[PDB]
Target: GTPase KRas
Amino acid sequence: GMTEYKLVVVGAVGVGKSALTIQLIQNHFVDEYDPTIEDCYRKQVVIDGETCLLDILDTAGQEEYSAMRDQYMRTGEGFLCVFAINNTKSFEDIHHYREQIKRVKDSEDVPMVLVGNKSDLPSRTVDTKQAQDLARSYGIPFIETSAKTRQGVDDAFYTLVREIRKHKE
Ligand SMILES: Nc1nc2c(ncn2[C@@H]2O[C@H](COP(=O)(O)OP(=O)(O)O)[C@@H](O)[C@H]2O)c(=O)[nH]1
Ligand SMILES: N#Cc1c(N)sc2c1CCCC2
Ligand SMILES: SCc1nc2ccccc2[nH]1
Ligand SMILES: [Mg+2]
Model:
């Protein structure tokens, strides 16, 4: 039948996880989404000629490591690790997110995509070369996005699906 891919969007509070997810699903930019609210979304799409269902969790709390929460995150098949290009700390947080994901999945090979969001901004503090190099060190794609303009949004999620497909093959 039609495969369902469980995707989890993670990253520091304020990087644009909710805005990215809502942009993917609803095709508009929500700029004041409650930072504490977690929700999930589904969307049927065709990727490389194969129809599939995306089941996406937009995470709120990024630091609750209960046994329940770990097992919940464990259901995730692919992770979008998002930072904001104007917050260096959010970029330096990525290392911890990847370590946590590897721990939770009990695997050194977890489908992941690094996402540098807010690319529409006229200023940035995270050099694109830094992010490219980090992504290469992890062996994962790097995608620049703007939830505001839609730039890279479909690309980020669909690239993650493609990463899951390769892993499962
Ligand atoms: N300029 C710009 N602002 C964004 C973008 N994505 C999110 N924001 C803003 O960043 C803030 C936090 O976004 P939010 O989606 O709530 O981030 P979250 O905490 O990771 O879910 C909000 O004020 C958004 O309006 C983007 O691509 N470009
Ligand atoms: N809160 C919380 C989280 C866990 N208990 S595991 C894990 C996250 C967020 C990032 C991914 C991996
Ligand atoms: S809330 C439904 C739902 N839970 C998930 C947990 C991980 C990835 C996708 C998910 N969708
Ligand atoms: Mg949010």
